[PDB]
């Protein structure tokens, strides 16, 4: 890192001088809790048929969605205290903060 800068770098490199990559792009996320995988290190829960998580069957993501998230569109409730702009800024902000690449 230069001894003296003036503006952010593009990648975030050098924001933190002691540990220059912190907040920089194309680095691993930090973890706040240790990861929990079927095999403890890489396979996601739901990967192997019949393999329970912590004593119980893993529920299909789609199924939870069907049973808990689904609702009739006509019941929709307008927020009397939030504009749609409140939604949109969240997504714009999300996109300043993280993007998780996956394979093409």
């Amino acid at each position: 890192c230069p001894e003296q800068d003036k503006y952010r770098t593009i990648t975030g490199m050098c924001n933190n001088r002691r540990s220059p990559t912190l907040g920089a792009s194309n680095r691993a996320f930090v973890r706040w809790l240790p990861a929990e995988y079927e095999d403890g290190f890489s396979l996601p829960y739901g990967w192997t048929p019949g393999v329970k998580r912590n004593g119980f069957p893993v529920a299909l993501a789609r199924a939870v969605s069907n049973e808990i998230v689904r609702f009739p569109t006509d019941q929709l409730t307008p927020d009397q205290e939030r504009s749609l702009m409140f939604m949109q800024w969240g997504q714009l902000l999300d996109h300043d903060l993280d993007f998780t690449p996956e394979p093409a």
Binding site: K6, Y7, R8, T11, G12, N15, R17, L22, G23, S25, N26, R27, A28, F29, V30, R31, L33, A35, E36, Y37, G40, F41, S42, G46, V58, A59, L60, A61, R62, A63, S65, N66, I68, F71, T73, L76, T77, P78, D79, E81, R82, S83, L84, M85, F86, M87, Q88, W89, G90, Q91, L93, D94, H95, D96, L97, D98, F99, T100, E102, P103
Partner: protein
């Protein structure tokens, strides 16, 4: 294997299986497509698999300027010394700048309307064309940069392009920080959690880790609960605009042609200011436009975003509801009864137990959005904790935080405190009537609206160099 077309579970595909009696997908041989996020350390069997963030975690408007040199460069107009960002050379929006087009190998925007032939936009972040509402915000910020750069030029004629770009970028970045922390986060978190997780700034602390935590990439997805099933466009009188004032969202994804060929960003920005968000409710969590029909127009099948959210947390090896509750210092319900108390809702608790068997296993997103919302906020205690914690690190751990001593002058800080998203909208569009502060609250025209003339502009005087 191709995860796009195959339902075979083979690295790197982790496809969502279909339950019996699914309301939409009747074929159990079918699946919802899913690619596992890239591993930080490919192949390792020594390292606990982790995922990658392609963006700068700092609130630095990298969604405008890019997060990598080559791209940041391409986004810049380098035909001159005006420090501008490149704008579209083929189309304009009532005389105003649009985003340049990108040159994707497989352009999904082109697919949304074959004859229109409008490709996706090129911006700091790759998702700018995801929905036109998002595109309009990107386009707004682009305009503001060049507007800023044009003013500065007038003030400091001797400033070269590099200097003009940086100074304008530095301002846009602060604006984003200000809107986010002054105006936005308080309405996400509520005043109580706001105090708790974001106490009064003091100054830069070089021991605060600014990285995005893996769990945040899922918890900040709470936003999906706010999504309306239509894109709403209004005219200059804030009335429904023709053509098609209420497009189902399933017909706006990647539809950049609507911005270019159906009236630019004005009608969309007005739609955003004067239409209410969806309210998250324990039996009205997220709409079928994203639950049944995400990206319908560009994928072999329609996606379920909430389900994806949940599969993604498993892919990322995130602990369950209760571990996070514990992390946050919140009680961890063990029984259906105890969960009912946390949720003030025994029916939902029952449904969750029926799905998961234990609150230990509830997926963080699902658990997050299930909790009753905090007063004057739009998340429960769990998500407020996770979200609040992240943004404090981004603030206290950012050496270029706008209030940090030495970054801006005192006078520049005073000038900056004057900015607002509504002003920014007045200065870069044909819209002359906008939301009252707070723009994220105001949602009823004309009750929550004012004339642009009533709002003071950003005063760039203190940027004058002798």
């Amino acid at each position: 294997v191709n995860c796009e077309t195959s339902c075979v579970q083979q690295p790197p595909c982790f496809p969502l299986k279909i339950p019996p009696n699914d309301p939409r997908i009747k074929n159990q041989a079918d699946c919802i497509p899913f690619f596992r996020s890239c591993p930080a350390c490919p192949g390792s069997n020594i390292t606990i698999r982790n995922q990658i963030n392609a963006l700068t975690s700092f609130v630095d408007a990298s969604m405008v300027y890019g997060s990598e040199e080559p791209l940041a460069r391409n986004l810049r107009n380098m035909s001159n010394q005006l420090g501008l960002l490149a704008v579209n050379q083929r189309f304009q929006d009532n005389g105003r700048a649009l985003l340049p087009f990108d040159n994707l190998h497989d352009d999904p925007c082109l697919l949304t309307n074959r004859s229109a032939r409008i490709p996706c936009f090129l911006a700091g972040d790759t998702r700018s064309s995801e929905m036109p509402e998002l595109t309009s915000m990107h386009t707004l910020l682009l305009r503001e940069h060049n507007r800023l750069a044009t003013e500065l030029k007038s003030l400091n004629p001797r400033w070269d392009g590099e200097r003009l770009y940086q100074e304008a970028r530095k301002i846009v970045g602060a604006m984003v920080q200000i809107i986010t922390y002054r105006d936005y986060l308080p309405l996400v978190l509520g005043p109580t959690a706001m105090r708790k997780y974001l106490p009064t700034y003091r100054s830069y602390n070089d021991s605060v880790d600014p990285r995005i935590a893996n769990v945040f990439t899922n918890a900040f997805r709470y936003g999906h609960t706010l999504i309306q099933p239509f894109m709403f466009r209004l005219d200059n009188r804030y009335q429904p605009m023709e053509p098609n004032p209420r497009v189902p969202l399933s017909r706006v994804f990647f539809a950049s042609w609507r911005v270019v060929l159906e009236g630019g960003i004005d009608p969309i920005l007005r739609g955003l200011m004067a239409t209410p968000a969806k309210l998250n409710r324990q039996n009205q969590i997220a709409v079928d436009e994203i639950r049944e029909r995400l990206f319908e127009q560009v994928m072999r099948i329609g996606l379920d975003l909430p389900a994806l959210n949940m599969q993604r947390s498993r892919d990322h090896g995130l602990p369950g509801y209760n571990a996070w509750r514990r992390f946050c210092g919140l009680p961890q319900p063990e029984t259906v009864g105890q969960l009912g108390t946390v949720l003030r809702n025994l029916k939902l608790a029952r449904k969750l137990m029926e799905q998961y068997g234990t609150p230990n296993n509830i997926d963080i997103w699902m658990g997050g959005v299930s909790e009753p919302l905090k007063r004057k906020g739009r998340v429960g205690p769990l998500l407020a904790c996770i979200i609040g914690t992240q943004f404090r690190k981004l603030r206290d751990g950012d050496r270029f935080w706008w209030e940090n001593e030495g970054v801006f002058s005192m006078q520049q800080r005073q000038a900056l405190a004057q900015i607002s998203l509504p002003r920014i909208i007045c200065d870069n569009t044909g819209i002359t009537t906008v939301s009252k502060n707070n723009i994220f609250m105001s949602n009823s025209y004309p009750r929550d609206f004012v004339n642009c003339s009533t709002l003071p502009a950003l005063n760039l005087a203190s940027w004058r160099e002798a």
